[PDB]
Design a protein around this ligand. Structure first.
Ligand SMILES: CO[C@H]1CC=C2CCN3CCC4=C(CC(=O)OC4)[C@]23C1
Ligand SMILES: CO[C@H]1CC=C2CCN3CCC4=C(CC(=O)OC4)[C@]23C1
Ligand SMILES: CO[C@H]1CC=C2CCN3CCC4=C(CC(=O)OC4)[C@]23C1
Ligand SMILES: CO[C@H]1CC=C2CCN3CCC4=C(CC(=O)OC4)[C@]23C1
Ligand SMILES: CO[C@H]1CC=C2CCN3CCC4=C(CC(=O)OC4)[C@]23C1
Ligand SMILES: [Mg+2]
Ligand SMILES: [Mg+2]
Ligand SMILES: [Mg+2]
Lengths: 205, 201, 201, 199, 201
């Protein structure tokens, strides 16, 4: 197989509308926000404007191919792939994607999609001008798929989600932590999972 | 049936431009606004900027399938479904959808669509800084389908309201109206949502 | 015929690129602006920001069907229909459509399309703070079709005007013009809508 | 032929990706800006916000039809036509098109396309508040086609809004040929000088 | 061959999703920024707003044709071509493309793509008001292709810079880097463009 064949095969047989589960085993999605720039902060309205790289990984075995004498990975337009329907629950603006909408697919079916996103959030900005800083929580999970269809999983301490933060920001990052949650909503009996990302930051000196 | 078959069947036989009226009864649509945030308020211009989850439900029996040895629900892109042509009659900005455009479909044909929407409204902001607060009315109904094609009915009032808003919700009431317009002999139904809110302490 | 058939037939045989001129008579288009809100006014720059419902009607006999054993009217996405290429000649922003892009089609081929539009205009704002008010003129006509292809005709001024606006409407008049442009020998029609309004208090 | 046949034929045989160079000759494009409004002006940043009608004409003989017992002209969505890849070289915002995207096509293959555009430009705003006024130059030409593929040629104050803060003193057009490092061939542009001032 | 044939052939056999690597050598991409304007600068937030022409060249031998009895070059919509997935790593707004999205393709398979882009960056603005000026670094490279798939290489600094800008360019230097990410073992290449500029007068 060459790249052209792999990409052709994926395009011709893609079901981007179909979550790649096998009932009742959920697709395990890992989500990790790499903060890049904090652009606007308003302590009066409790709103923040943020740029981050949304590292997103999951496995889709319908995409796998024999890697022998073939490339190990390809870049695929996300329009040809199923992609998890993640949403930021406390977002107050449309997510503005700043990067080419391509995912990286490995021959074993592992997918990495990492868009750079600019987006505005409603969160706690109180304390941003103090040395303790503000703690802004961003809640990300599947909009429509419950825990038996999509499970979302959180970084540990070992993930440094501030390692690409711009040195030229007015702001600086003190800490970034993730908390996994399961929530039940009135509409449905099943629980929905989310990752809660706590961004601890402050205005510099 | 597996998920892929259900979704394939729906996509291949979808008539998204066809209202699923059966027995000439109107399609019964339930609408309910869950307010999440109140972002900007202007008592001089009487304008408000709001984020809400628009809980929308109706039945489309053309989508039903067998719930034995099969999943009970699937997520479907709305581009493959008929969706009610609801509009907010006193909106002054385009509805900005903040969520993936997917609906949840149950095997009996019940559909739930619930986009998160940011939108600006012209409404009564007077009294926002008082104890009694302001009462802003939002009117939502079908743009083009009258009462014999679509009927609308309303379905913790701060259940999902952000604790970090400058504002707080005192009460939300959701009422049903029938209105006749000059163009048509028929009555058009809407839900009128009264949002009573005020600036925090 | 049922709804699904009518909509299928329209979609399958639609020529949205083709003006439905019958014989060599122009398509008669009626245009009428229902003002809903006046949101921003600037007397220094002579610009106004306005929300209106653009009531637009014309006949397309290629869409007609036998109304026996059939619905009387259907809602059709405008992408399946020819729609007149109307433009506001003194607009200074893109028209922002706030409503579902659907037209209402009667079995005799009558079409009604009525989007809610927010748009900014360059017009005379002088006198807005006086008792006489300002008179802002909005010029609407076909961008590319002359008077033998499209003719435009006008058809309570505050009927749907928001009671919460900073402004109020004194009068709305509509008159009809034919203009000849250097490019072409044929005349182009427009409707000129005069909005007489003033700041309250 | 009726209207529907002409439009069907055009749609079915349209090559909107293909410049209609006949006999190996450049397509002659005429460009003319009709200024309608001047909305914002900033003498500190040298930026101007402008609304204009971009009169654009050229010949595409692949579109011609026998006019006998047929309409002489039709309106065609530009998505069905080749259209010159004109750009404003000193623009600093995306062109915002305010009109239906239709061209007018005559039976001999002449095409007229005239969008109303609002766009922001970087140009010389100095002197806007004096009676000599400012002279803002707008440079428009093909982005990718050189002078043997597209040639541009010009062809006043007629539709300018009476309600603008500004007024037009004069509009002149010059025709330039420029060579760029990438290519040996010359690229043509029209330079439009807008002389205007505060009222 | 005529122009129409070349363009037809390219469109009919185009694989825009497929990087044109040959013999498992990376596609060599040349990137060069021609600065046209500096529109807004903020020394407090360290942000800059910039317009530049992104000169981008590479070879795609699948596009080559016999130039005998044929045009040497054509203009092709980029939607019909593979284009490198370059991104500005320190960009804080979406790239706003100001020019027709067309590339120039030579009969030997060389491609030149040069969009005019307006975009905002986070970079060092300190010293903009001094004689020494600020030095703003812009990092551009493939988003998803490593050094064995795409290699990037750089090619008057004020040549196309607008004479009417508040600012002036002192120097522009470009430098290739290889970076390894936690992501992946392979190294990713970028070009780092250093723009040394200052406030006029
Ligand atoms: C179809 O979209 C619905 C489908 C299922 C959901 C559970 C999680 N999700 C977001 C929050 C939310 C709901 C539904 C609800 O009742 O309230 C809030 C939904 C969106
Ligand atoms: C085609 O879209 C029209 C079709 C039918 C309607 C009934 C309610 N609806 C919104 C307001 C409104 C009208 C019709 C009208 O003339 O008055 C105002 C419409 C939209
Ligand atoms: C391409 O669409 C053209 C076709 C015919 C027109 C007459 C009315 N219309 C708007 C004003 C206007 C023109 C053309 C012209 O030369 O003057 C300005 C046009 C647009
Ligand atoms: C592919 O698009 C290129 C192809 C040919 C061009 C000459 C005119 N044009 C605009 C300015 C410009 C260039 C190319 C260049 O290197 O300098 C700047 C181009 C765009
Ligand atoms: C989906 O595209 C990913 C695939 C490979 C990459 C290396 C360069 N690139 C940008 C920054 C970046 C990553 C990957 C990563 O995990 O960290 C940061 C990527 C995007
Ligand atoms: Mg092969
Ligand atoms: Mg692995
Ligand atoms: Mg030939």
């Amino acid at each position: 197989l060459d790249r052209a064949d792999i990409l052709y095969n994926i395009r011709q047989t893609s079901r981007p509308d179909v979550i790649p589960t096998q009932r009742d085993r959920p697709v395990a999605v890992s989500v990790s926000l790499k903060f890049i720039n904090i652009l606007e902060v308003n302590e009066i309205t409790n709103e923040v404007d943020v740029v981050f790289w949304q590292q997103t990984t999951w496995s889709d075995r319908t995409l796998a191919w024999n890697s022998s004498h073939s490339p190990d990975q390809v870049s695929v337009p996300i329009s040809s792939l199923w992609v998890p329907d993640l949403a930021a629950y406390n977002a107050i603006s449309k997510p503005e994607v700043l990067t080419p909408q391509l995912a990286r697919v490995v021959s074993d079916g592992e997918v990495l999609y990492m868009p750079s996103i600019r987006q505005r959030f409603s969160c706690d900005v109180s304390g941003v001008d103090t040395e303790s800083g503000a703690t802004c929580r961003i809640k990300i999970g599947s909009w429509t798929h419950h825990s038996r269809e999509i499970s979302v999983d959180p970084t540990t301490e070992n993930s440094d989600d501030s390692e690409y933060f711009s040195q030229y920001s007015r702001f600086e990052i003190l800490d970034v932590t993730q908390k996994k949650n399961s929530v039940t909503y009135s509409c449905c009996p099943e629980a929905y999972e989310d990752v809660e990302v706590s961004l601890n930051f402050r205005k510099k000196g």
